[PDB]
Structure formats: structure tokens, C-alpha cells
TrEMBL record:
Superkingdom per UniProt: Bacteria
Entry binding sites for Zn(2+) 1: 12, 46, 50, 106, 110
Keywords: Metal-binding, Zinc
Pfam families linked to this entry: Hemerythrin
Residue positions binding Fe(3+) 2: 50, 72, 106, 110
Name the record gives this protein: Hemerythrin HHE cation binding domain protein
Keyword Zinc: yes
GO molecular function, one term: metal ion binding
Amino acid sequence: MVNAYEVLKEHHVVIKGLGRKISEAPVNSEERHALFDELLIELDIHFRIEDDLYYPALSAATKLIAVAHAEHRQVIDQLSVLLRTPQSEPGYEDEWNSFKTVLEAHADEEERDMIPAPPEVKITDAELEELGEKMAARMEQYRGSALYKLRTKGRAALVRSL
Ligand SMILES: [Zn+2]
Ligand SMILES: [Zn+2]
Ligand SMILES: [Zn+2]
Ligand SMILES: [Zn+2]
């Protein structure tokens, strides 16, 4: 029996783990480039399940919902800056660290304020299980479409979809 909080917390662990593997791989290595694509896939589907399923269930917390969505903008805006410095360029590792910091702050801020749901949100244990089930299935569906984009249309197309 999984629930919505566990789905998101377990996926934050995945994302943080990819971020650590990226950081540990040599700059501009084949390994680091593949790991970064893997992170983009997981990030794409993570923000979508938050925006499409989890945050709507929490809509009664209007101020924290606004902050949550603005924090997504923070991550996407920083990703745009990161992609303007390729790994072959001297300032790349500074840009990667700046992005990693913003990404890690997403999860930390969410796990402070929004997991579990804020007090204004009335959601039952049974509803959290059904929501967790829907999120887990939607994650598989979204990963399929994210991969389709990356495979058939490229990394740029996957970034434009965030
Ligand atoms: Zn890998
Ligand atoms: Zn988020
Ligand atoms: Zn969003
Ligand atoms: Zn999250």
C-alpha cells in the first residue's frame, strides 16, 4: 500500500541520487552526459505528476500552492541558464552546482511545507493511497512519453516540455 507522500519522497531520493552521480562523474564524460539526460527525464515527469495530480489535491493551501509552482519556475529558469554552458566550457561546474542547489531546494522546501499536506487540506488515508496509486501509474506513462520525446525529437525537445 503506497501513498502520495511516499511516491514523491521516493522520487526525490532518485533525483538526488542522479544529481550525486552526475557530480561524481568527470566533466564532459560520456557517463556524465547520459546521467544528465536521465535526470532530465525524471525531472520532467516529477514536475508533471506534482502539477497534474499532487498539487491539485492540495489546492486548498492556496499560498503554498502558489509558492510551489513558483519554485518549479525557479528550477526551470536555472536549468535554462545551465544549458547555455556546455560541459566543455570552463564555467560549467559552477553552473552545475548552482542548478543542483536550486533543485535540492525544491525537494527540501516541498518536504517542509507540502509533504504531508498542509493543515487546510482535508485528505483521507484512503485518498492518499488512491492518489499515490494514480501518481505511480502516471509516472510510468509520463516516463514513456518523455523517452519518446528524447529518442525521437532530442534533448532540446525534452527541455521545452518542462
Ligand atoms: Zn545511468
Ligand atoms: Zn515540485
Ligand atoms: Zn510546475
Ligand atoms: Zn518534488
